[model samples]
Structures are given as C-alpha cells and as structure tokens.
Target: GSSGSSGLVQGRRVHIIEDLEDVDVQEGSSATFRCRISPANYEPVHWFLDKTPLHANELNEIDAQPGGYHVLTLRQLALKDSGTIYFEAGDQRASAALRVTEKPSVFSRSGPSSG
Candidate 1:
C-alpha cells in the first residue's frame, strides 16, 4: 500500500548478485555452478548447456531457493561436457564455460603429477 505504484517506468529492479563461475575439473569429476541474485524470490530458472537445455533427469541437476540461490550440478563430467553453461532467470542470466581435462597434470597418479 505505497505510493507511485506502477506510475513510472524503470529499469530492471531485480538483478543477479553472483555469477556462475567457469569450472575446471578433471574428467569423471563433478562440477557445480552456483549463482545468486538481489531481491531474492522463488523463480524457476533455466539451465542450458551449449545452448541445449539441461534437465535433472538428463545427467544434470539444479536447485533453486527463495534466497536467490541457484545451483547446477554435473557429475562425471566427460570431455563432451566441456562447453558453455548458462543459468537464466527471467531477464537476468549468467554464463560460463566448463573445462574438463582428461589428463590434468595436478591430478596425475604418478610421474610428478605430470612429467
């Protein structure tokens, strides 16, 4: 019950406070993408991989909270999982790339972790 309700045009009133970060993980590893927004509310966000929609039943998972917290989980990431990922909620969206390495030097079983 305030004044000037829908009386003036304004830009986006809600916004993303956090962005999904690019994840670099070894093959067969798990990667998680998280994001947050201001003026938090429960909104159904969409997840996309390389322009293709992702579903929890399709080798991926997503969680959204009313606190503006969103998450996307990809397990056993393979080389084919290396691509751009997008988390879109309304007009606010964030994008990042998932880099999956088959033979990461730091994840070596032997040979100085690489050499």
Candidate 2:
C-alpha cells in the first residue's frame, strides 16, 4: 500500500458544520464516510478527505438534497485508511472519525477481552 498510488488528494473548505462524529466498521469489512454540511449561504460546496478533494473536478460538489447533506462511500476497509475525516462546504464545516476494527463476540467482551 503506497501513498502515491492513489490519485492526488485535494483540500476541503470548512463551513458552518461542527461536532465530532464516529463511524464503526469491522475489520476486513467495508464502510462509508458520511459527511454532512451545515446550512450556510454559499454558491457551492466542497468536500475533502484527509485534506484531499474528493471530487475529480476539485472545485465543489453541489448538494442534491436540502440541508446540504452529502455522502461519500469508501467501499473497502484498510488499516491505514482508518482515521478522522474532514468535511467542508459553504461557510460551514465539521469533522468526524471512522474506526474499523475486528468484531468481538458477546462473551468475548464480558468474559475476557484483549486490547
């Protein structure tokens, strides 16, 4: 897994959105990075993943629905890819962290679990 292998990352603008979010994904599983932009008076919206622009144009990804709620799905789950995801739009922006780990059974936790 090389860093340069993937396409060039882009920068995301920070809007009015705020609050920390958490996403849970099991190891060897797929998870989506859900991003929401707060309401703001702006011409367009932009999204960034780990300081990189998500869209190919690298300008803005307009919201299709109201409230400027948008989403970007990361089909595959990787160890290195697990971290906080940043979003930006209009005059609002927020941050959320995604955690991907191995699933634990019910008894495994109550009885004994290893970190």
Candidate 3:
C-alpha cells in the first residue's frame, strides 16, 4: 500500500523541476546560470561547482523573485571553471555545465570546445 501510495503522492506533488537554463561564457568573462523550480514552496537552494561546494563568498546570489525562483551568478569565469554546477532544493536536485572558453582570438571562430 505504502509503495503505491508513495509513488502516487510523488507524482501528484507539485515539485516538478524542469530543465536547467543553459549558461555559456568566454574565458575571463562572466556568466550566470539559472533554473526553474515548481510548487513555489520548496526551501532555499544550494549550489555546487564541479562537485565542489560553492560558498556564499564564492558566489553572488540574486534576490529571489516574489514567485520563489532564485539565481546563482558566477563572475569572472575562466577555462578552468568550466564544469558541472549542481543545485538542490530540499531533496530535489539538478545540475548544469558551464561552457567556458579560453579568451577568444581574432583568428579563432569557435568558442571553448567541450571538455
């Protein structure tokens, strides 16, 4: 009974999280990655960079909109900073990669290749 009800409740709960907004940036440039959360009652979010925890001092947090969405902004992005950045809201979690490039050049037409 609990298994079926549990699955039903999970399906019914409004915690549906959608895709993470893509973030692209040039080396030494800055970029902000964002995502959308559902239900609007989830707890505050936590962010991780390349599996490493990102502290408040290491990140700039934008004020959460009245609707409960928040953003984590990363400044001065570098080639070394390109990697997966994960986020969590209570138990729900998601991750996105920060596509980075090593400063574009006049001869270089393409951006940072996938690492």
Query: What are the lDDT scores of the predictions, listed in order?
Result: 0.70, 0.50, 0.61
Residue pairs that clash (backbone atoms under 3 angstroms), model 3: none
lDDT of 1 at 78: 64
Residue 41 displacement in candidate 2 (angstroms): 9.2
Q: What are the runs in model 2 whose C-alpha is more than 4 Å off?
A: 1-20, 39-45, 51-53, 56-65, 102-115
Worst 10 residues of 1 by lDDT: 106-115
Query: Tens digits of per-residue lDDT for model 3 on 5-83?
Result: 3332333233435636667777555567656676565555677778566645433444455454656666555676788
Best by lDDT: 1
Give candidate 3's error at residue 80 in angstroms.
1.5
TM-score of 2: 0.48
What is the per-residue lDDT of model 2 for residues 1-115, given as tens digits with 9 covering 90 to 100?
5555546555654445434367777643545544444543433545555644545222222343445445455544345446766665544556777676765422222212133
Runs of candidate 3 exceeding 4 Å displacement: 1-16, 104-115
Which 10-residue window of candidate 2 scores lowest in summed lDDT?
Answer: 105-114
RMSD of 1: 11.7
Native-to-model Cα distance after best TM-score fit, residue 103 in candidate 1, in Å: 6.0
